[PDB]
């Protein structure tokens, strides 16, 4: 699969859910998984969003530190869903705070992390098709 396309379509959906139109089965499964995750952890996401205080000064370090901590001792599909939802949080905060150019940066950072850090794990664990299979019983 093309990880950049996965990132771009995911972010476009997170932003469209906030009323923002960003000029950029796997997609739909990831879409529902991320929504289920942030609905399940609504209070936690609300607290994260209120402490982000996102600025162009802090965005790169925020992203790198959260993601490094998230995968500190390894990878699983839940942590990958969390990675996408956290990227979505940063993008929504970007447009909310009239910092919409940061969305382009965040999408680049997410694509670079998926391609150059998570790729070997995704490949060794059956690829995105394995994720579709695992989450399939939770769809609809």
């Amino acid at each position: 699969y093309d990880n950049r396309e996965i990132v771009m379509k995911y972010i476009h959906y997170k932003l469209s859910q906030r009323g923002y139109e960003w000029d950029a089965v796997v997609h739909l499964t990831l879409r529902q998984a991320g929504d289920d995750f942030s609905r399940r952890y609504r209070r936690d996401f609300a607290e994260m969003s209120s402490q982000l205080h996102l600025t162009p000064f802090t965005a790169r370090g925020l992203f790198a530190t959260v993601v490094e901590e998230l995968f500190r001792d390894g990878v699983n599909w839940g942590r990958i869903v969390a990675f996408f939802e956290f990227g979505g949080v940063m993008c929504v905060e970007s447009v909310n705070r009239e910092m919409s150019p940061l969305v382009d940066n965040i999408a680049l950072w997410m694509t670079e992390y998926l391609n150059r850090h998570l790729h070997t794990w995704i490949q060794d664990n059956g690829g995105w098709d394995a994720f579709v299979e695992l989450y399939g019983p939770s769809m609809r």
């Binding site: 399940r40 936690d44 994260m48 982000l52 530190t65 490094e68 599909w77 839940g78 942590r79 695992l134």
Partner: peptide
């Protein structure tokens, strides 16, 4: 330290979530 805290909580939640599949 905000980002370190966010990442740790996201990790915990993630591991709970994947157990729910």
């Amino acid at each position: 330290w905000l980002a370190q805290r966010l990442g740790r909580e996201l990790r915990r939640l993630s591991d709970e979530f994947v157990d729910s599949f």
